[PDB]
Structure 1
Amino acid sequence: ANEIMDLLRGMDARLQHLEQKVDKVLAQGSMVTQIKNELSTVKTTLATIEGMMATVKIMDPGNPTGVPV
């Protein structure tokens, strides 16, 4: 009779910390979002470096400049 109710509260309790463990992982996305925001700046600085290298490469006078189309 009452034993089943006892184990029932036991289940409620178990699930209650299921929430906690999950609450933690949901809160783990904080970096994921920031790292995306800052990776945007990493991307633009990378692109600038790549463009500078392309420009210096084509600045050599041995091989003349050929524009696509």
Structure 2
Amino acid sequence: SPLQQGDLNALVTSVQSLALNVNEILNTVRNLDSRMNQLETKVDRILSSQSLIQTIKNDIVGLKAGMATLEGMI
């Protein structure tokens, strides 16, 4: 059967239909990019506090040495 314009047109519509799926992917990965950026900022906030924990650890160690001092003094 001779190739016809309609055969080429069928491929055009197929590609344009595929393009709509590509468009959803692109919109979604851009949204994920923005959201991962925001997530990292929040992870940064958590990290900054996690070392406030290290100070807490030190203060508690100091409190223990003190409490032993109270008991040692009787």
TM-score normalised according to structure 1 size = 0.74
RMSD of aligned residue pairs (Cα, Å): 1.7
Q: Does 1:23 align with 2:25?
A: no
Q: Structure with the greater relative contact order (CA < 8 A, sep ≥ 6): 1 or 2?
A: 1
Q: Which residue of 1 aligns with 2:43?
A: 36
Q: Which residue of 1 aligns with 2:65?
A: 58
- Segments of 5+ residues of structure 2 without an aligned counterpart are 1-6
Deviation of the 1:22 alpha carbon: 1.3
2:62 alignment partner AA: T
Could you say which structure has the larger radius of gyration?
A: 2
**Could you say which structure has the higher helix fraction?**
2
- Segments of 5+ residues of structure 1 without an aligned counterpart are 64-69
Partner deviation per Cα, 1:17-40 (whole Å, 9 max, x = no partner):
210011111111133221232123
Runs of 4+ in 1 over 6 A off after TM superposition: none
Q: 1:30, 1:40 → 2: CA distance?
A: 15
TM-score normalised according to structure 2 size = 0.70
2:34 alignment partner AA: A
Q: 1:18, 1:26 → 2: CA distance?
A: 12
User: Percent identity among equivalent residues?
Assistant: 8
